[PDB]
Amino acid sequence: QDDTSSSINFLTRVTGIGPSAARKFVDEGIKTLEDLRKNEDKLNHHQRIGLKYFEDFEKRIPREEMLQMQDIVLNEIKKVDSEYIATVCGSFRRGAESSGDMDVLLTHPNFTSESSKQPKLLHRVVEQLQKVHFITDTLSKGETKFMGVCQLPSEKDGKEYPHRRIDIRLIPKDQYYCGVLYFTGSDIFNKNMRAHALEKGFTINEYTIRPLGVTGVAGEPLPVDSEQDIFDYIQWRYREPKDRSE
Numbered sequence: 001q002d003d004t005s006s007s008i009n010f011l012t013r014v015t016g017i018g019p020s021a022a023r024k025f026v027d028e029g030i031k032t033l034e035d036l037r038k039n040e041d042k043l044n045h046h047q048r049i050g051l052k053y054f055e056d057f058e059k060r061i062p063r064e065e066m067l068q069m070q071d072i073v074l075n076e077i078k079k080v081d082s083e084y085i086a087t088v089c090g091s092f093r094r095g096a097e098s099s100g101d102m103d104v105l106l107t108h109p110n111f112t113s114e115s116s117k118q119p120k121l122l123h124r125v126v127e128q129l130q131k132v133h134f135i136t137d138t139l140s141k142g143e144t145k146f147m148g149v150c151q152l153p154s155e156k157d158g159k160e161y162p163h164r165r166i167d168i169r170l171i172p173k174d175q176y177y178c179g180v181l182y183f184t185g186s187d188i189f190n191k192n193m194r195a196h197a198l199e200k201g202f203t204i205n206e207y208t209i210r211p212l213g214v215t216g217v218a219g220e221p222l223p224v225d226s227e228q229d230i231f232d233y234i235q236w237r238y239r240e241p242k243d244r245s246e
Contacts, residue, residue: 007031015050015057015165016043016139046139046147053137053149056162060098065161068152069102069134076128077106084108084125085176089183095242101165102150105179113172113207119143122170136163144170175207177227182206189244197234209233 004026011022014036025031030039036051043051050057061069070088077084087093090103106125111118119142126146129135137149146168152161171179181204182190197204203212208221209230224230231238 011036013058014047014054016046016048017050021047049137049139049149053163057165059162060100061102061164063092063097063099065152065164066092066099066102069150069164069166072132072134072152073102073104073129076132076134077125080124080128081108083110085173086125087180089180091185093184093241094186094244101167103183104166104168105176105183106168106170107173107176108170109173111170111172112174115172117143118170122146122168125168135166174221174224177224177230178204178207178209181227181230184241184244186245188246189239192246193234193236193239196236200234202234204230204234 007026008019008022010031011017011025012019014033017025025036025042028042030036030042033051033054036043036047040048040051066088070092073088074086077086084106085108086104086106088102089105090096090099090101092099092102106122108118108121111121122144123141123146126135126138126141126148129150133151133153135148135150139147139149141148146166148166149163150166151163154160169179169183181193194204197209198212201212203210203218209224210221211219213219222229222233228238
């Protein structure tokens with residue numbers, strides 16, 4: 001069993017291959033990266049691109065590169081429409097010295113929670129980033145979420161940076177800063193802040209902050225025009241992201 005398990009665990013390191021699909025591959029004698037490459041016909045698109053960048057996707061991103069990536073993303077988005085608002089979240093926003101991926105939250109005042117889908121608000125940004133060769137591949141592209149691959153431009157002698165995972169999520173403007181709060185984390189900090197909100201008569205989720213009565217009925221979403229507004233409602237001092245480990 002040891003070798004069977006090691007094979008399954010190996011394939012799960014490919015993005016797009018989860019434990020169940022890995023078990024099915026190994027049952028078919030597909031166990032290594034070489035086996036996967038010889039059996040590209042059995043892969044979906046996400047798995048094929050994850051195999052393509054297997055080694056790169058096991059490398060971390062130094063904060064220095066994250067800052068370069070951030071400027072490319074922010075500068076190109078502003079070129080498409082200066083009314084877009086985009087924020088890099090995750091442990092990067094909390095000041096982490098390295099990141100596993102880049103997670104971008106995107107909004108636009110044309111897109112509110114009363115809106116039906118506006119996928120081209122997302123796709124136009126993806127297309128511009130592809131046009132300047134920053135986004136290199138797509139893992140999946142939906143009406144509000146893009147998961148793909150990017151790469152910093154070569155700086156010297158044609159030497160290449162590793163390809164990196166990037167996600168871009170389109171969020172309604174009236175829910176944007178609650179989203180930024182949630183996706184900045186940490187998970188423990190989010191739990192602690194939601195517990196304090198309850199003590200103060202509010203309930204916070206990924207989308208909204210609402211007043212919460214003694215019977216447990218949530219009221220209407222409160223207006224939020226900055227992350228600071230959410231802390232103001234629950235009477236907490238603003239917690240800078242570097243202070244959100246717990």
